[PDB]
Write an enzyme that holds these catalytic residues in place. Structure first.
Site, PDB file in Angstrom:
ATOM      1  N   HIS A  40       0.815  -1.207   0.000  1.00 40.93           N
ATOM      2  CA  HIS A  40       0.000   0.000   0.000  1.00 40.93           C
ATOM      3  C   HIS A  40       0.856   1.268   0.000  1.00 40.93           C
ATOM      4  O   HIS A  40       0.326   2.375  -0.030  1.00 40.93           O
ATOM      5  CB  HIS A  40      -1.003   0.011   1.171  1.00 40.93           C
ATOM      6  CG  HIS A  40      -0.414   0.398   2.492  1.00 40.93           C
ATOM      7  ND1 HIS A  40       0.101  -0.523   3.380  1.00 40.93           N
ATOM      8  CD2 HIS A  40      -0.282   1.607   3.089  1.00 40.93           C
ATOM      9  CE1 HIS A  40       0.520   0.101   4.465  1.00 40.93           C
ATOM     10  NE2 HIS A  40       0.300   1.395   4.314  1.00 40.93           N
ATOM     11  N   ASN A  54      18.099  11.683  11.314  1.00 44.05           N
ATOM     12  CA  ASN A  54      17.271  12.881  11.208  1.00 44.05           C
ATOM     13  C   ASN A  54      16.995  13.040   9.716  1.00 44.05           C
ATOM     14  O   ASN A  54      17.887  13.411   8.964  1.00 44.05           O
ATOM     15  CB  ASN A  54      18.004  14.120  11.712  1.00 44.05           C
ATOM     16  CG  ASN A  54      17.127  15.353  11.672  1.00 44.05           C
ATOM     17  OD1 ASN A  54      16.449  15.610  10.674  1.00 44.05           O
ATOM     18  ND2 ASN A  54      17.129  16.125  12.756  1.00 44.05           N
ATOM     19  N   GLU A  62      24.260   8.971   5.051  1.00 47.13           N
ATOM     20  CA  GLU A  62      23.174   8.651   4.143  1.00 47.13           C
ATOM     21  C   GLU A  62      23.628   8.189   2.764  1.00 47.13           C
ATOM     22  O   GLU A  62      24.731   8.503   2.306  1.00 47.13           O
ATOM     23  CB  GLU A  62      22.251   9.864   3.980  1.00 47.13           C
ATOM     24  CG  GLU A  62      21.811  10.501   5.286  1.00 47.13           C
ATOM     25  CD  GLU A  62      22.728  11.627   5.741  1.00 47.13           C
ATOM     26  OE1 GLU A  62      23.963  11.510   5.595  1.00 47.13           O
ATOM     27  OE2 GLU A  62      22.213  12.634   6.256  1.00 47.13           O
ATOM     28  N   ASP A  84      -0.062  -7.573   1.954  1.00 43.97           N
ATOM     29  CA  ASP A  84       0.450  -6.206   1.894  1.00 43.97           C
ATOM     30  C   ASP A  84       1.981  -6.231   1.985  1.00 43.97           C
ATOM     31  O   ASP A  84       2.567  -5.958   3.040  1.00 43.97           O
ATOM     32  CB  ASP A  84      -0.153  -5.388   3.049  1.00 43.97           C
ATOM     33  CG  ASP A  84       0.141  -3.895   2.942  1.00 43.97           C
ATOM     34  OD1 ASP A  84       0.698  -3.452   1.916  1.00 43.97           O
ATOM     35  OD2 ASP A  84      -0.194  -3.162   3.899  1.00 43.97           O
ATOM     36  N   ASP A 171       2.068   1.985  20.106  1.00 42.13           N
ATOM     37  CA  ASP A 171       1.652   1.408  18.836  1.00 42.13           C
ATOM     38  C   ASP A 171       2.378   2.119  17.695  1.00 42.13           C
ATOM     39  O   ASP A 171       3.016   3.152  17.908  1.00 42.13           O
ATOM     40  CB  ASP A 171       0.130   1.612  18.701  1.00 42.13           C
ATOM     41  CG  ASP A 171      -0.467   0.896  17.510  1.00 42.13           C
ATOM     42  OD1 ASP A 171      -1.662   1.129  17.222  1.00 42.13           O
ATOM     43  OD2 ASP A 171       0.242   0.103  16.873  1.00 42.13           O
ATOM     44  N   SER A 172       2.306   1.555  16.490  1.00 42.68           N
ATOM     45  CA  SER A 172       2.907   2.206  15.327  1.00 42.68           C
ATOM     46  C   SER A 172       1.808   3.142  14.826  1.00 42.68           C
ATOM     47  O   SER A 172       0.679   3.091  15.330  1.00 42.68           O
ATOM     48  CB  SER A 172       3.306   1.176  14.257  1.00 42.68           C
ATOM     49  OG  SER A 172       2.279   0.226  14.029  1.00 42.68           O
ATOM     50  N   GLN A 174       0.485   6.396  11.538  1.00 44.92           N
ATOM     51  CA  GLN A 174       0.583   6.952  10.191  1.00 44.92           C
ATOM     52  C   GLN A 174       2.034   7.329   9.892  1.00 44.92           C
ATOM     53  O   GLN A 174       2.672   8.029  10.676  1.00 44.92           O
ATOM     54  CB  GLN A 174      -0.318   8.192  10.065  1.00 44.92           C
ATOM     55  CG  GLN A 174      -0.665   8.572   8.627  1.00 44.92           C
ATOM     56  CD  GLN A 174       0.500   9.185   7.862  1.00 44.92           C
ATOM     57  OE1 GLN A 174       0.630   8.991   6.650  1.00 44.92           O
ATOM     58  NE2 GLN A 174       1.341   9.942   8.560  1.00 44.92           N
ATOM     59  N   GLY A 175       2.553   6.851   8.763  1.00 41.78           N
ATOM     60  CA  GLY A 175       3.923   7.174   8.397  1.00 41.78           C
ATOM     61  C   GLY A 175       4.936   6.090   8.714  1.00 41.78           C
ATOM     62  O   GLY A 175       6.064   6.125   8.210  1.00 41.78           O
ATOM     63  N   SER A 177       4.156   2.918   8.165  1.00 41.87           N
ATOM     64  CA  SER A 177       3.850   1.874   7.189  1.00 41.87           C
ATOM     65  C   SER A 177       5.033   1.475   6.320  1.00 41.87           C
ATOM     66  O   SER A 177       5.815   2.329   5.886  1.00 41.87           O
ATOM     67  CB  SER A 177       2.680   2.314   6.303  1.00 41.87           C
ATOM     68  OG  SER A 177       1.491   2.396   7.072  1.00 41.87           O
ATOM     69  N   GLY A 178       5.148   0.170   6.072  1.00 42.63           N
ATOM     70  CA  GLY A 178       6.233  -0.358   5.263  1.00 42.63           C
ATOM     71  C   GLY A 178       7.439  -0.724   6.109  1.00 42.63           C
ATOM     72  O   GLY A 178       8.287  -1.518   5.693  1.00 42.63           O
TER      73      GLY A 178
HETATM   74  C1  LIG Z   1      -4.405   6.676   8.141  1.00 44.86           C
HETATM   75  O1  LIG Z   1      -4.399   7.354   9.458  1.00 44.86           O
HETATM   76  C2  LIG Z   1      -4.138   6.748  10.739  1.00 44.86           C
HETATM   77  O2  LIG Z   1      -4.153   7.400  11.805  1.00 44.86           O
HETATM   78  C3  LIG Z   1      -3.822   5.182  10.815  1.00 44.86           C
HETATM   79  C4  LIG Z   1      -2.396   4.908  10.306  1.00 44.86           C
HETATM   80  C5  LIG Z   1      -1.751   3.580  10.692  1.00 44.86           C
HETATM   81  C6  LIG Z   1      -0.974   2.894   9.725  1.00 44.86           C
HETATM   82  C7  LIG Z   1      -0.354   1.655  10.031  1.00 44.86           C
HETATM   83  C8  LIG Z   1      -0.512   1.091  11.324  1.00 44.86           C
HETATM   84  C9  LIG Z   1      -1.297   1.746  12.365  1.00 44.86           C
HETATM   85  C10 LIG Z   1      -1.436   1.168  13.647  1.00 44.86           C
HETATM   86  N1  LIG Z   1      -2.474   1.339  14.453  1.00 44.86           N
HETATM   87  N2  LIG Z   1      -0.525   0.376  14.220  1.00 44.86           N
HETATM   88  C11 LIG Z   1      -1.914   3.009  12.010  1.00 44.86           C
HETATM   89  N3  LIG Z   1      -4.780   4.295  10.099  1.00 44.86           N
HETATM   90  C12 LIG Z   1      -6.089   4.206  10.385  1.00 44.86           C
HETATM   91  O3  LIG Z   1      -6.604   4.715  11.382  1.00 44.86           O
HETATM   92  C13 LIG Z   1      -6.957   3.432   9.417  1.00 44.86           C
HETATM   93  N4  LIG Z   1      -8.160   2.827  10.032  1.00 44.86           N
HETATM   94  S1  LIG Z   1      -9.692   3.391   9.619  1.00 44.86           S
HETATM   95  O4  LIG Z   1     -10.693   2.786  10.686  1.00 44.86           O
HETATM   96  O5  LIG Z   1      -9.546   4.945   9.690  1.00 44.86           O
HETATM   97  C14 LIG Z   1     -10.032   2.916   7.990  1.00 44.86           C
HETATM   98  C15 LIG Z   1     -10.551   1.607   7.694  1.00 44.86           C
HETATM   99  C16 LIG Z   1     -10.810   1.279   6.325  1.00 44.86           C
HETATM  100  C17 LIG Z   1     -10.544   2.252   5.297  1.00 44.86           C
HETATM  101  C18 LIG Z   1     -10.802   1.966   3.875  1.00 44.86           C
HETATM  102  C19 LIG Z   1     -10.027   3.537   5.624  1.00 44.86           C
HETATM  103  C20 LIG Z   1      -9.769   3.875   6.961  1.00 44.86           C
HETATM  104 CA   LIG Z   2      19.759  12.702   7.319  1.00 43.87          CA
END
Ligand SMILES: COC(=O)[C@H](Cc1cccc(C(=N)N)c1)NC(=O)CNS(=O)(=O)c1ccc(C)cc1
Ligand SMILES: [Ca+2]
Length: 223
Positions: A40, A54, A62, A84, A171-172, A174-175, A177-178
């Site tokens: 994704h 940083n 780098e 994924d 927890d992990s 947004q950002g 990912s991967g």
């Molecule tokens: C996208 O914004 C966010 O705050 C998190 C990011 C994220 C990414 C990877 C891992 C974690 C983690 N918790 N460890 C979080 N994802 C969400 O909150 C997405 N869930 S959701 O309930 O908002 C959702 C469900 C289905 C669709 C199509 C779109 C959005």
């Molecule tokens: Ca750097």
């Protein structure tokens, strides 16, 4: 990363940053010329940045390398995020050293209760937003599948696993990912998805890498 700690400059040598004008996802270096991330996170015009700490300041260790080919898993479902996982081949081999090193693939799947290391440059707030410039780390145990479904209600496939704390707070996010999930010295997971971040009874979900070793090896030996 929510509720984690600053890792320390180059203490996670296999961690990479995917850049397309800015950081948008993490990844892991498995050898001198290949990177594994989440499907994704796919995008055109990806530049891989190794030896980073940083991400907004050139510190001296780098290595910026363009991608030549991207391979999303053949069965990736963007709706369920099943399978994924994605492979990225670098235009040229990276120079491996103390600050830039590869992480080994697993020969067996990690078990419930095993402590792992998760890292990334993702959001550090469960509510609102705050992005760090340096790499953050987090210790988290693999959870049993039944305990995960019971608490979260999440629909997990056999290609996913949960890790974290049902209590929330860590927890992990947004950002991240991967990015990598390392247990017992091997790459066991890829930050894939979740519901919000660090929410109670809503742990993170990760791609189970041990199920993809065969695919990865065959693809790399022929590309
Ligand atoms: C996208 O914004 C966010 O705050 C998190 C990011 C994220 C990414 C990877 C891992 C974690 C983690 N918790 N460890 C979080 N994802 C969400 O909150 C997405 N869930 S959701 O309930 O908002 C959702 C469900 C289905 C669709 C199509 C779109 C959005
Ligand atoms: Ca750097």
């Amino acid at each position: 990363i929510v509720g984690g700690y600053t890792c320390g400059a180059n203490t996670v040598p296999y961690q990479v940053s995917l850049n397309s004008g800015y950081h948008f996802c993490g990844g892991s270096l498995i050898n001198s010329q290949w990177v594994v991330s989440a499907a994704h996170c796919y995008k055109s015009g990806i530049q891989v940045r190794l030896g980073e700490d940083n991400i907004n300041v050139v510190e001296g260790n780098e290595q910026f390398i363009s991608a030549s080919k991207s391979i999303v898993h053949p069965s990736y479902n963007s709706n369920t995020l099943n399978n994924d996982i994605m492979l990225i081949k670098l235009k040229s081999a990276a120079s491996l050293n103390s600050r830039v090193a590869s992480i080994s693939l697993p020969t067996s799947c990690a078990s419930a209760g095993t402590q792992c290391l998760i890292s990334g440059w993702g959001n550090t707030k469960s509510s609102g937003t705050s992005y760090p410039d340096v790499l953050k780390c987090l210790k988290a145990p693999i959870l049993s599948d039944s305990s995960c479904k019971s608490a979260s209600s999440f629909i997990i496939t056999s290609n996913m696993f949960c890790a974290g704390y049902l209590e929330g707070g860590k927890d992990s996010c947004q950002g991240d990912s991967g990015g990598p999930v390392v247990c017992s010295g091997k790459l066991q997971g890829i930050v894939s998805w979740g519901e919000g971040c660090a929410q109670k009874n809503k742990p993170g979900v990760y791609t189970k890498v041990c199920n993809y070793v065969s695919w990865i090896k065959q693809t790399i030996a022929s590309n």
